[PDB]
Design a binder for this molecule. Structure first.
Ligand SMILES: Nc1ncnc2c1ncn2[C@@H]1O[C@H](COP(=O)(O)OP(=O)(O)OP(=O)(O)O)[C@@H](O)[C@H]1O
Ligand SMILES: Nc1ncnc2c1ncn2[C@@H]1O[C@H](COP(=O)(O)OP(=O)(O)OP(=O)(O)O)[C@@H](O)[C@H]1O
Ligand SMILES: Nc1ncnc2c1ncn2[C@@H]1O[C@H](COP(=O)(O)OP(=O)(O)OP(=O)(O)O)[C@@H](O)[C@H]1O
Ligand SMILES: *[C@@H]1O[C@H](CO)[C@@H](O)[C@H](O)[C@H]1NC(C)=O
Ligand SMILES: *[C@@H]1O[C@H](CO)[C@@H](O)[C@H](O)[C@H]1NC(C)=O
Ligand SMILES: *[C@@H]1O[C@H](CO)[C@@H](O)[C@H](O)[C@H]1NC(C)=O
Ligand SMILES: *[C@@H]1O[C@H](CO)[C@@H](O)[C@H](O)[C@H]1NC(C)=O
Ligand SMILES: *[C@@H]1O[C@H](CO)[C@@H](O)[C@H](O)[C@H]1NC(C)=O
Ligand SMILES: *[C@@H]1O[C@H](CO)[C@@H](O)[C@H](O)[C@H]1NC(C)=O
Ligand SMILES: *[C@@H]1O[C@H](CO)[C@@H](O)[C@H](O)[C@H]1NC(C)=O
Ligand SMILES: *[C@@H]1O[C@H](CO)[C@@H](O)[C@H](O)[C@H]1NC(C)=O
Ligand SMILES: [Ca+2]
Ligand SMILES: [Ca+2]
Ligand SMILES: [Mg+2]
Ligand SMILES: [Mg+2]
Ligand SMILES: [Mg+2]
Lengths: 330, 330, 330
């Protein structure tokens, strides 16, 4: 029958054009794939001045709000903090969150099993006029974290400019590429701000723009902390010129339900010696967690993958043909 | 022949059941898989008081033993340390390990080729009553680490509550998930401790439990340090509800031969200015290394993978047909 | 025809030898592969003394030039720095590169839009005898990074030694391996310098050797910074003894155009309280970025992969035979 042969030839032509357009053209089967070796360096330029009650104006610079000063990929930018100054190890009332005592017999000497704040001395001392807390041995000023300033202490963090420098190299092809691609110039790096459409190649990122692109409001996130994931994808083709290869930036927002564990926070201390006594300043920093992830591959023409793809296509064709023949026979 | 046809039909039904079951349900071929983007946030609540001979009581809060303050995925929990206080730059004798001199002519001015402790002035000074070491220009006094305390200075950290906050997002499906799940609530985290069977979803991990579940003993590991690897694996079947998505926590113990470089250790310093002179405190910290590795995939029903799996199954059936026909013919 | 049968048997023998040798031995189809869990700990030893104008001799020990105390995979080794001692908050002139005014009416009170150095007060005080800049609120000694010392302040960094301790474990096969191998002993590490041929397995890497093997000159890197990538690769056939399992160390040079953003740099501050006044020392450190990446796979004989490979080979054979038969059939 003529129509049977027509259907067979149509099926073989379909599978042939499918394999040819997909394995070779679409999926780049004639190009080897390798993995980039990458290193990310980050620099933040911004300044914010905080004026808390009872304290002088505090100037925060790049060394201050960037705790991973060595330019790590996973860095935290300080946006809100609680400062407990002049902490010294001595005996005083603990925080009321741990426990509340009405008499000295209630307190027991030892360490708390859950959320230990210090070594209990077994004495109940008044934390303030109303309630009393068991006396512990720990840094004496105990941070009350219950009050979270509604206006962010560093609401200026939104405009802080952020520069990301990424250098990727493929080992098998011995090709090195950097984010600061050709189009970028020193003059450009002075007056550009990153945008999804306007300035895709500008390496200077605005913190507020990055947060808003992820899908989070900067103010509410800075009030309680947050996590933002920036991914740099280097899809590269070596058959073309290296100028074509460029870094694509994608912003991903990592969030969670606000009732439980809202935002991101950590505690850090600055140890110093004043008047011959060792003292420290405890800070509970509510900041936005920025993670840089670089994943990419390079493709360059090679003879062995081309021959293997040709053989696989011939095998798939010769199969499809025998399968169609057996189907038409039965 | 009847028996030949029966064997042929049996082989056909067997390969049909195989291609309809294995690649579809077991391998989830109709689903497509996307790697997660994740961020690790770790908070350790605990307090340990270390009493050292010649020094006052030392309180080590969360910021102290957790050296990475920004909540990095790889963090070290301090278990034992060697403290050398009041280090100042000057000319003081070197450690006996570097060299032993009996006369001033033996010492050579310059810097030692390997593991230099300072700039040798060229004079042999008595390090102590018995042996003499060449004078060097370095921090004073030089740290001595020949003796490691057999009882861990921080042994209370066996009980330290470790809270891991891991937020994942799949870019292909645009679904954000966190280690905290609907089953876990605010009242649950107050008293729960992670267990392999009892509390698999509790985000609070005990350090001793993590060490014991990794095939290591905390008591022996705390003396010289160690490396414990925690892997959080997410397997998600987006065909079901998102409540079924639950993280899987696996603890892997990374250990080596005790004879050659046992445990993990590092040295850090705190710089301060006392009495108009720059001084520092050098600590040789023996701590357990914790690495959080999050690797997972999610699968949702899609039309193109389903069609590809159907085509692959039909192709496998076709050849299982002829392979059987050619064998029965022989 | 006899020639047709000879050609058929020749093609049969060719495809049989192929499916018996290539996929089995070269591809290790009978073995299974699993990803390892790796944690890297780095330790450096070396001392460098920097003598500056006015300031006394400064000793930079391991804790100084190694900014990551814990020793993460990504660490920076200080080679050159710019120190602005005794930075105290107050009113001072901004940097001349920021802005220059001839009259006080030029500057406007507020915060700069880009790269803010402080809060302008609307007054112009002379930065030096020639030009005058806007008066800002912040650290009084402004850091001037126009002059970079051509001789590296820490050129002694080239010969500093680097010890890398990596422990890898395959969870599927429950086998733990370390960079320290049976060939390496305690007396060997005392004097081993890593080399590609002479000493392949020693974990003591010379910084200058690592920089030179990556393809970069240390002296140029020392002045303005650099990036060096070290990759450890483990390929182990668990069918043989575990002694054969040895890591492979490869150095990759990550560099970019020197005209735009040459080298790697960052700023960190040391906060201290002297004379009841909070001051800091700001250092602009030019250092070489070192990144450690570990990847590997292991192979163990298993029954299911062997059976799957045998089935795939039989299928490829059965197809090749008939495809050849159709070829002759024409
Ligand atoms: N976060 C940022 N925002 C805006 N511009 C930046 C940022 N980081 C770097 N740049 C600009 O990019 C150029 C090249 O960066 P490079 O690493 O040389 O910084 P730098 O010149 O050492 O820093 P500085 O400008 O503080 O001296 C610099 O001229 C700098 O002005
Ligand atoms: N390591 C830990 N051990 C025990 N409980 C913890 C731990 N980390 C967090 N929690 C509990 O989880 C709850 C939510 O924590 P969240 O991430 O909101 O930090 P936080 O409440 O701002 O910090 P803090 O508890 O210091 O106020 C807290 O009420 C706390 O009691
Ligand atoms: N960067 C390095 N260069 C040369 N030798 C090193 C280096 N790091 C460690 N070693 C040597 O390797 C041996 C085993 O390493 P290990 O991790 O036990 O160091 P350690 O003995 O704790 O350090 P230290 O020698 O400061 O006590 C040590 O005897 C040490 O001398
Ligand atoms: C005392 O502290 C407790 C802490 O919960 C608080 O509720 C109470 O209002 C305080 N009382 C005064 C008078 O400040
Ligand atoms: C950021 O700068 C813009 C002007 O470009 C200003 O309107 C905005 O208030 C600034 N951000 C904050 C919240 O300080
Ligand atoms: C600077 O880079 C931009 C990139 O958009 C380019 O358009 C411009 O021509 C460059 N400047 C010079 C002087 O080449
Ligand atoms: C002196 O120091 C050396 C260091 O190895 C030690 O062996 C010796 O016992 C010490 N002698 C005294 C009297 O402390
Ligand atoms: C808290 O979570 C636990 C999970 O084990 C659950 O059993 C309990 O009902 C929850 N509490 C409330 C009030 O729902
Ligand atoms: C003053 O500072 C400017 C800053 O660029 C410099 O160009 C100039 O040479 C300096 N003048 C003197 C006398 O130091
Ligand atoms: C490093 O090389 C040799 C040791 O091999 C040493 O003598 C020389 O002084 C050093 N040079 C530098 C640049 O530190
Ligand atoms: C130390 O290791 C080296 C490896 O090159 C080996 O040749 C030597 O025999 C070892 N020393 C001892 C005492 O076994
Ligand atoms: Ca890291
Ligand atoms: Ca101080
Ligand atoms: Mg609280
Ligand atoms: Mg030692
Ligand atoms: Mg500059």
């Amino acid at each position: 029958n003529k129509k049977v042969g027509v259907i067979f030839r149509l099926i073989q032509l379909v599978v042939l054009v499918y394999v040819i357009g997909w394995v070779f053209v679409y999926e780049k089967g004639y190009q080897t794939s390798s993995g980039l070796i990458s290193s990310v360096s980050v620099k933040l330029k911004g300044l914010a001045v905080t004026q808390l009650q009872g304290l002088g104006p505090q100037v925060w610079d790049v060394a201050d709000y960037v705790f991973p000063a060595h330019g790590d990929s996973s860095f935290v930018v300080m946006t809100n903090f609680i400062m407990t100054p002049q902490q010294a190890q001595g005996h005083c009332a603990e925080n009321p969150e741990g426990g509340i005592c009405q008499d000295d017999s209630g307190c027991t000497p030892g360490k708390a099993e859950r959320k230990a704040q210090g070594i209990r001395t077994g004495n109940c001392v008044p934390f303030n006029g109303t309630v009393k807390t068991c006396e512990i041995f720990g840094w004496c000023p105990v941070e009350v974290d219950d009050k979270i300033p509604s206006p962010a202490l560093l609401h200026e963090a939104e405009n802080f400019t952020l520069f990301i420098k990424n250098s990727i190299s493929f080992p098998r092809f011995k090709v090195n590429r950097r984010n600061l691609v050709e189009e970028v110039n020193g003059t450009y790096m002075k007056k550009c701000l990153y945008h999804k459409i306007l300035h895709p190649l500008c390496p200077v990122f605005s913190l507020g723009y990055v947060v808003r692109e992820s899908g989070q409001d900067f103010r509410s996130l800075a009030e309680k902390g947050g996590v933002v994931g920036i991914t740099i994808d280097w899809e590269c083709d070596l058959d073309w010129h290296v100028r074509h290869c460029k870094p694509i930036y994608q912003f991903h927002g990592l969030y969670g339900e606000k009732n439980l564990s809202p935002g991101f926070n950590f505690r850090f201390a600055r140890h110093f010696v004043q008047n011959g006594t060792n003292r420290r300043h405890l800070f509970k920093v509510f900041g936005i967690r920025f993670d840089i992830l670089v994943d990419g591959k390079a493709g360059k023409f090679d003879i062995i993958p081309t021959m293997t793809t040709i053989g696989s296509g011939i095998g798939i064709f010769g199969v499809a043909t025998v399968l169609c023949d057996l189907l038409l026979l039965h």
